[PDB]
């Protein structure tokens, strides 16, 4: 007589082994993979009940999203194949195609817990200041990928929810306008601001703000994607093979 020895040559440890592979594949295939499908569907070129989230500052938004107007893509196919790559028809930086593509986000300024505009410059965020030890970029030139001074940083844009700098505001030389850039595209020096993403002649076409003192989520995508396009589209050599 053995502890766990039931009928046949089977044991309790054998039965649970099946029940283990039962619950796992159930959670994996009938739940986890279904939740993986709440964004990016249906298939262009098994589905779950579209989930609802009550927003922090009044209202709701359902995933996945359906917009009232479509964005035409200025691209043309390279060949007649289905998985064939696409080629930019003009300037990919302004048309926003490929690595320059921004998502179809809402045109509202991000908000803190207390409602206030999250991403604001130090002129709107007066109580915020730079920590002792790091460089103050206000008054330092911005040298582009080709080694040319594209402009000068005038102010800093801070996230009022996490206490973390995100953007650098610089007035473009020979443009009289101000252009934003995510800190990820910058190498902080004490005398200069190093940007290898785009050319100096391409600092003028950086997506323009609707307001000087506030930024919306869609505008935060337009700017961030613009410099990401330059990684592959700044010089006619950044598109072809390295070797």
């Amino acid at each position: 007589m053995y502890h766990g020895a039931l009928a046949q040559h089977l044991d309790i440890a054998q039965l649970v082994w099946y029940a283990q592979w039962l619950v796992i594949w159930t959670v994996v295939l009938l739940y986890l993979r279904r939740e993986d499908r709440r964004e990016g569907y249906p298939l262009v070129e098994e589905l779950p009940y579209p989930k609802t989230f009550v927003l922090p500052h009044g209202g709701t938004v359902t995933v996945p999203r359906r917009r009232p107007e479509t964005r035409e893509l200025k691209l043309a196919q390279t060949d007649g194949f289905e998985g064939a790559p696409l080629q930019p028809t003009g300037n990919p930086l302004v048309d926003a195609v490929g690595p320059a593509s921004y998502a179809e986000r809402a045109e509202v300024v991000d908000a803190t817990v207390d409602g206030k505009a999250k991403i604001v410059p130090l002129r709107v965020a007066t109580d915020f200041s730079i920590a002792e030890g790091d460089v103050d970029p206000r008054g330092l030139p911005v040298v582009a990928a080709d080694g040319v001074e594209a402009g000068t940083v005038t102010d800093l844009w801070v996230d009022r929810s996490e206490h973390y700098f995100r953007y650098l505001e610089l007035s473009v030389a020979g443009s009289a306008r101000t252009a934003l850039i995510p800190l990820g595209f910058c190498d902080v020096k004490k005398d200069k601001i190093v940007v290898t993403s785009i050319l100096s002649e391409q600092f003028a076409n950086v997506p323009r703000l609707q307001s000087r003192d506030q930024i919306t989520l869609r505008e935060e995508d337009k700017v961030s994607a613009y410099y990401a396009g330059g990684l592959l589209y700044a010089t006619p050599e950044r598109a072809e093979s390295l070797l």
Binding site: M1, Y2, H3, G4, A5, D11
Partner: protein, 332 residues
Amino acid sequence: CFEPPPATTTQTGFRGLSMGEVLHPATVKAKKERDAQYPPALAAVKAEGPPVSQVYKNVKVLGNLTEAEFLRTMTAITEWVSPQEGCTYCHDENNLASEAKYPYVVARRMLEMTRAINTNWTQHVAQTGVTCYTCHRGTPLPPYVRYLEPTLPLNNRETPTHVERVETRSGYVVRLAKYTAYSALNYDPFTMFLANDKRQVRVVPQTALPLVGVSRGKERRPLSDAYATFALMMSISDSLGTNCTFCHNAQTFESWGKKSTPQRAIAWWGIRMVRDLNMNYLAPLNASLPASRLGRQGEAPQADCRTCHQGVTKPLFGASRLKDYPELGPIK
């Protein structure tokens, strides 16, 4: 801190199992040069003459041998036991028959012991066998001896520190871990396994499922038995300068056959031999040895794994003096 490359490794299992010894070429060569100090065999003597039973006054074991062989034996015995003092360590200078000193009566019991190992315990010692030197190494007190409690250092020739001394209770774990090869196993494998046949080493069941009547409550053996088995094996592995793979496929330590090497069987006969020597031979001599040689609980120093091996899988690297001295076993 680190043992410089390269390292000598062997294969004890099927390729890809990573079974085999992991050895340092400097450590082993330091061990061979210590073991090579083995005194060579004495010159061949005359076999013609009357046995020493008729010749001498007090001989009860080696009585069949000739006077030429008996003196040779005693000359060899001195070279392995007490060479720093000589004949007079166990004898009175004027009287070689009298048993006035303590190292005489112990020696005669040790003779019947040494003969027994090379006659009866040949499954372990084989044609290699053992002599007086294998443990004593030219000293009256064997370097590696065990009491009823863990002591430091392992080699008793070394001068101990205050904490390492058995008197200071602050360094008990220090004496406890070093015998179990630097492991915090709170179990002495000598007093529970190596001293007597009271405890079973094997703790792993031979059934895939727990039998009803042994696996519930007080019916069960405590987990402490699995700890102590592991504590014993550590003492075993460190004493032979090797690891588990030398005798086990780590896949299953309990199973024999392809999972066990031919050395694991020898090791098993090693456990059964050590106990017989401890109980029948190395336990009743506490009245024969002085109060200075005794431990704390009135016990005589007893042997284990390292007593002959001293850090090698074979004691003295396969050195045999069995044919050279037939008077130490096997006995016809």
